[PDB]
Structures are given as structure tokens and as C-alpha cells.
Ligand binder design. Sequence first.
Ligand code: FCO
Ligand code: NI
Lengths: 532, 300
Amino acid sequence: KLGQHYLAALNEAFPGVVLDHAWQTKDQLTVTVKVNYLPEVVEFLYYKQGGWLSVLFGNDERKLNGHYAVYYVLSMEKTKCWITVRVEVDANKPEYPSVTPRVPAAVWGEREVRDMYGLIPVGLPDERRLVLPDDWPDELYPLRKDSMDYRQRPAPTTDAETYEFINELGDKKNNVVPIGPLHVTSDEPGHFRLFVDGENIIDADYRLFYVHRGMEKLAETRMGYNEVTFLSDRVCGICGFAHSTAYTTSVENAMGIQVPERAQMIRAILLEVERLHSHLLNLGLACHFTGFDSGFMQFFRVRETSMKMAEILTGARKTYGLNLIGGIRRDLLKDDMIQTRQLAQQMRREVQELVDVLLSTPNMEQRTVGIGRLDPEIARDFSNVGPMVRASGHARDTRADHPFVGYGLLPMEVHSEQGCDVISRLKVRINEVYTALNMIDYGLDNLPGGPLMVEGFTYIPHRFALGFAEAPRGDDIHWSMTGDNQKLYRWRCRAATYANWPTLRYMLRGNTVSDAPLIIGSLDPCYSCTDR
Amino acid sequence: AGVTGIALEQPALIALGLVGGLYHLLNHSLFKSVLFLGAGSVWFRTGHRDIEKLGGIGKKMPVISIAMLVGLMAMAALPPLNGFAGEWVIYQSFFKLSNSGAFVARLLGPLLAVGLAITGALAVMCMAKVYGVTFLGAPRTKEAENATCAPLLMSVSVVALAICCVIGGVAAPWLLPMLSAAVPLPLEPANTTVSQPMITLLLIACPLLPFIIMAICKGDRLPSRSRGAAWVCGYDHEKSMVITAHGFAMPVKQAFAPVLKLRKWLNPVSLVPGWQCEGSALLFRRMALVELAVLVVIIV
Ligand code: FCO
Ligand code: NI
């Protein structure tokens, strides 16, 4: 059983704090600790044991045990397992000690739980509203199961935005350069405040969650089990198969569900095919701010032949719908599989020539070095997970630590650079394109065979687990608890860029105005995945 | 240029340098009086002298705003106003310097033209900034919108000065030979004249053609409305988001940094021993009463 050593270390460091512990799967572990001793346990597992704060979230278990539940998912990466730290916040006085003064990665999860559930982490410095809009009435906490109906819409208190932006390094003489929410080539709402002195950015604050639909509440009220796979696809058009596989594996880990052999690694094939689509889009956007546009339209061309295998492996463009809880909906056939193999190869042909642009190295040496540097010291604290943390030096990858859809039968390579520039994050994505093309080269020629679907099973109530996938921008951790045979009790999703966002203040600092859209797009944000 | 001409025994250089210099002297005194009196009227109606905290004055006092527009376009040398004619004669004297036989004058000929183009472009920028952050945009202080119109004789004086500036601008070919009666000899631009009246006629009649074209090409055109705020990309507009004289003069601090740092270097203020005295400011004004009283009476 994985995770015994960390539990023993927690027991010897803290003798009588672990009130209860249980195993979800072999590599999944949860512990219930004391409420007043919570920040020491998570800080210990974070700093001393080398754990990364993946996701933390609240729960409404007042009719299950009479208490709120705040979970703290930690990824052990020094074998490698999942540890969740659970606390039982009191009902009529919801207050638990905060982790943000100890672990900086707990700054927005503890701001989200102030809004969705109304729980109060005492000692949290950033007390501003995060997810709910500025016109939201105060005490309506949406994710409380008895606060309001999902269909209720309060009257907007204000038409103007009342958000407060902090200026850490600037003063009352600095000007601001908005870059949202309605900006061209941003293609997605998100506000930015560049506190500039000239063209240099002194400080940078931002307002997000303009695309907060509220699908966490809607996934547990109006919508079932097989239908949330459609909700996960319609979050963003480019992580659709990442969210669906992350949600599906959360529900199949919550029960047994011994999925058939080829239905695992076909999901591994389509997970990598999607990162051909998303990385080559970012590399096209990397050339549209570096300068050349005949490097963009051409990355659009190699993106189209990545869309051509996505046309034949599924038959759809963007949002799809190919996974169910037991297995995959539509199934690949022989010629599709022989064909995808050399269109993978001709892309490796085309990708090599198009990557000869950085070999050219003129705006790819002066515009993309020393710009938007992310400190690996900072990236370790805030627990970034995408190509950000792989460029900064940490070999953080879900497919190597935790093979979820049969990646152990596929050739896995983790690429980590040393520089922390924009050009370093492009080199992460360039080596990931060849890596994903090696898996398409080695996946579709040796399928194990067998069935595709496992259905007819009954959902055991109040069973939960963690589901994870390797999205193109990092990992998405999906935690879902089964409610009954039809509905979910609670489904929580954290986007790949949700962990990535709180370090944009430390990238845009010291840079210029002109390359500031390049710094934001260097990590390839998916606002719709993080805004939920 | 005139002194170099009288050194080189070139009468055309002497004539061009002296009348260019003295015409620009008279014109500069005119539009500088315009600018100082108008800025004083703005302070008289508001109370502020800082242009950061002085916006939106063009709608409160429009007569003063038009007068400062004339003065700013006259100081930054723009045709057909009076600051352009003297600069034109000075450029003609520079070209006469560039063709005279002297290595100290031929090397110094086109360099003066290049740097005077620098100075003209910087002046155009400075007055663009001054008119933008003072008489245009929304006001940035509650003391600004409370400013009513200018007084009677203040407006009369500033408008009369602006009228004299416009008169000295367009009638330069009729006033330059009047100044040829003082510096007494022929004016010899290098085969070229400039004619301010035809530029004046060609700057009021040419913008009528796009007006006629838009009056013809309009169909169901609604009347023009000025209702909302500036487009600031979806978010609402705030007082901290407008760009003012602080942010408008940043690339000149960006590119001309060595001269602005040379401002701090050659400052021998700490080398004077008695400069930091308690009563040195009052002592200077104390002997000022003594000095004026003893020097007036000996003349009388
Ligand atoms: N990649 C991606 Fe979408 C985001 N952020 C997910 O997961
Ligand atoms: Ni996304």
C-alpha cells in the first residue's frame, strides 16, 4: 500500500493528530486531522516531505456528519502517492486555521472557500472576493446545499466594479494599463492592471472569474453522472478531453470499475493528440508577439493536420464527448489507426522545419530572454504545475508520477529546462510535441484489444476519490463524491492554470508593457478552465 | 549668424541673421505674453498652477482656450503663425552659413539645422502635452469645474495679444521689409520665398473639402453625440487611468537620459559656503532695499 511511510512520519511528528485515515485506491490516501492543528500538518507534508499543494476545497457534509469538510490534497513526489488532509469545521461557527501564512499555494483555494461555502480561514491576509462577481449579495454562499436554489438570481447591487487592486511596489502616481476584460487577441475575458511607470511594469494586479458560470453547483443539482462528461467538455474547447478524463477517472476510482485494457490507453492516445492541438496553438501565438506572422499562419497549418487526426479519431472539432464512466463512447478502427501513425510522422517532419524559426534566433533571442522570469523559488512555494514549473527546473509531470490511463505502457519522457524565460517555456512545449508524437507512433500499433465498455454497475453512495489528467497547461485534479445511483454529492475541479495564475504578479514585474501580452501568453492561459 | 556674417563680410548673412533674430524676438515676446497671461487667467479662475491637477479648462473658459491654442501653435513654430517666420529666416541664415567659405562655418552649418529640428519637434511635443493635459479631457480636481469664464479686460488683453500674434504671422512678408529699415541692406533667401497668406488660405479652404465630402456621402447619419466615457477595454473609467504630463514625457526621459542626468551633475550648489544659511534669503532682500535706494538717488 502506497503512503504508509508518510503516514508513519506524520504519526511520529504528530502523535495523536490523525483522527482517521483511509485508502481510496492503492496510491490514494486521506487523513482526518485535528482542526486547530491543521496548518502544521500540511506545512510539514509540503516542506519537509516534498509535497505539492494540488487542490484544496470545502464541502457541505452537515447532513452526513454535522460538520463542514475542508480537504487539502497533497501530491507526494519524492513511492509517489496522494495524501488528502481533511478537517471537520464546526457548523454554526465555521472557522478553521488558515494555511496561507505557511504555504503560499493556499492563497486562492482559501479565498474560494470564503465565497462558495462561507467558511472563514482565520489569519488569511488576502480577504478579497475571488470567484463571485462584485454585484453578488453578501451572505448568499452558492455551494452551500441549503443557501439558495441553483436557479435563483439575485438583483445586482452595483453596475460598476467595486474590486480593490493592491499596489505592492507602486504608489499613487503610477498609471494603469488595462488588458481586459474586452481586449483583442485575448479572445477571453480577464482584467489586468499594469501599474506602470513609463513602459516598465512596476506592479501588476488582475481581476479574474469573469467567466464564472457556476457549474460546480449545477453538476450536483440538475445533472447526473454520464452527463457531467458533457459539462467537462464545455468548460474550454482545448482541455475538453483533459477535464473529461480527469472527471471519469475520479468516478472510476471511487468505485472499483476494472476498465477494459484498450479503453485505458486510447484515452492516453487522445490526451496526447489534444496537446498537439494546444501546444501548436500557443507556439503560433508565440510567433504573433515575437514578430513573425508567417510563423503563426504556418503553425496554424500544422495545427490543422493535428486537427485532421482529431477529425478522424473522433469526427469532431473542439468540444467532443468520447468518454463515459465505464469506458469510451465511439471506438477507433484499423485504418484510422494505421493512418494516424504517419500523419504523426509527417507532423514530426513539418514540426521540425517550422521549429527552425528559433534556430533563426533574432526576436527569439532578445524579446524572449530575461522576460517574464518565474523564480523556481517562487514556483515551488505557489505549486505551479504546467510548463512553467518544468521550465523553472522541477520535473513535475502527472504521467510519470501517477500513470492514470495506462501511460506505463507508453514511452514517457519528462522534459525540464533550467532557464525561466519565455523561450524556455517554448522549449518545454517543443520537446513535448516530439514526446507526444512518439506515443502516437508507439500507441496505435500495439493495441491490446478486448472490450470497450463496462456498464450496469451500481454507484455506491458517499464514495469519493481523486481523478487526475495531464492537461496541456498542467494537471487538472478532479475530486468527486458519489451521492447515489443518479446524482453527485459534490464534484470539485481545479484547472491546470488555477495553480499557475497567482504568480503572474512576479512575472510581469520589471518588464515592459509591450511584451506583457507575451508574458501572459507564455504560460498559455485557459480562463474558461480556471473561471469555471 | 549675424555676427558670423559681419565677421565673414557677407552682407546677406548679416541681413538674414539680424532680421530673423529681431523678428523672432518681437514675435516671441508677443506669444509669450499670450501664454503667461492666459495661464495666469487659468490660475485666477481656478487657483492651481500644476497641469496634473488642472484638466478640463477648455470648456469652462473657451475664449482663453482658443487664445492658448493660438499661443502654443505660435511658440512651437507652426505656419502661418509668427513663430514660424523668424525660424524660417534663421534657417535661411543657416543655409547661407552652410555655403560660405570657412571650415568653422561649413561644419557648423547643417548641425545647427539638425538641432533646430530637434528643438522644434521637442517644442511641438511640449505644447501638445500642455494643451492635452490642461485644456482637454475631463477635469481632475473639483476646483477645476467651479472655474467660471475669464474676466472682461483679461480676455480683452489676451485676445488682443493673440490677434497681434496672428497679424504678425500672416503679414510677415509686409513686416519683414519694415524691419529691413533697421538692419539696413537686402534680404536674400536662397532663391526661395515663403508666403504666409497662401498657407493661411490653404489651411482654411483645404479642410472644407472633407467637410463637403462627408456632407455629400452621408445618408441616414444621426447627429453626433458626446455622451459616454472613453473606451478602456470593458472595465469602467477611473481618474488613475488617464495619461497625463507625468506619463506623456516618459520616452524623452527614455531617449534623452544623458542630458537629464547632466542636469544633476553640473550643479555646484553645495560648493558655496554661505548658501545654506538660516537668513541668507532675507539678507539678500535686506541689502536689496539698501542697494535700490542708494543707486536711484545718485542718478536723480
Ligand atoms: N490545459 C488545460 Fe484546461 C486549463 N487550464 C485543463 O485542465
Ligand atoms: Ni483550459
